[PDB]
Design a protein around this ligand. Structure first.
Ligand SMILES: COc1ccc(Nc2ncc3ccnc(-c4cnn(C)c4)c3n2)c(OC)c1
Length: 256
């Protein structure tokens, strides 16, 4: 097939993602340059839902200038019936990639970590807290990890393993809540499992996330700095939890 976005024609090479209201296509332009078009159908969307999309688009727009750790959005076309967004094409999402590889290089993990931190930090500067970080929110774009969404818009092909105790306790959120979710991801690339994956019952799991008494397992590893970063990220009390700016000045992110 084919599609037009602001007079520019793109040919559909493959469909990258499936969403209830959206699809992601791998496409090529007239110049034969690859791009990803997120198509969102607006035929049956509530006004509240519409506002969220407008917020996530506006966010992708301003940040562009601030950082390259956020996926580049080249162009967009919005109508009552649909939303078309011209973005850069990544090799793969971080979740799909993680499942594929049994073991991850220490150097790669350090590079991906510094990229995640730098991107999340940018969103925080503007006052945005994702509160829903998971690997799928990340995308490998030629050795660089980029942030796809701020979580306002619907995710595509959910988990509870990356949820911070303060989210569940409120039932508040702070940039420190994003640190918890990131620490889980890092903990996953260091131990191959999320801190609470071992609990079957999702109710018991939420209890495990919020129980001070429950103690997270931190097995001995060659990288002491790496071990230190995890321990510092997964402190149940956010006031006692490390910050992104501090994490950027850590030995692990700066010393190999
Ligand atoms: C799982 O396989 C892929 C995931 C992502 C990509 N690339 C890519 N590039 C830009 C994107 C922009 C927005 N959303 C996605 C996305 C979200 N979920 N999935 C799934 C892809 C993008 N994926 C891919 O390319 C060939 C394959």
């Amino acid at each position: 097939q084919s599609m037009s976005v602001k007079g520019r024609i793109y040919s559909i090479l493959k469909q990258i993602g499936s969403g209830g209201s959206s699809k992601v296509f791998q496409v090529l332009n007239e110049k034969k340059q690859i791009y990803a078009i997120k198509y969102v159908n607006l035929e049956e969307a509530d006004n509240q839902t519409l506002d969220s999309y407008r917020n996530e688009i506006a966010y992708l727009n301003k940040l562009q200038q601030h950082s390259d750790k956020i996926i580049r959005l080249y162009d967009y076309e919005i109508t009552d019936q649909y939303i078309y967004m011209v973005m850069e094409c990544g090799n793969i999402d971080l979740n799909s990639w993680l499942k594929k590889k049994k073991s991850i290089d220490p150097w790669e993990r350090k590079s991906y970590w510094k990229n995640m931190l730098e991107a999340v930090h940018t969103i925080h500067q503007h006052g945005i807290v994702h509160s829903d970080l998971k690997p799928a929110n990340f995308l490998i774009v030629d050795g660089m990890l980029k942030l796809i969404d701020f979580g306002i818009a619907n995710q595509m092909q959910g988990t509870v393993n990356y949820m911070p105790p303060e989210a569940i306790k409120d039932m508040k959120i702070s940039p420190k809540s994003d640190v918890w979710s990131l620490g889980c991801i890092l903990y996953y690339m260091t131990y191959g499992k999320t801190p609470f994956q071992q609990i079957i019952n999702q109710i018991s799991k939420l209890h495990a996330i919020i129980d001070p008494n429950h103690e997270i397992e931190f097995p001995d590893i060659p990288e002491k700095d790496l071990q230190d970063v995890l321990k510092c990220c997964l402190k149940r009390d956010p006031k006692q939890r490390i910050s992104i700016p501090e994490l950027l000045a850590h030995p692990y992110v700066q010393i190999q």
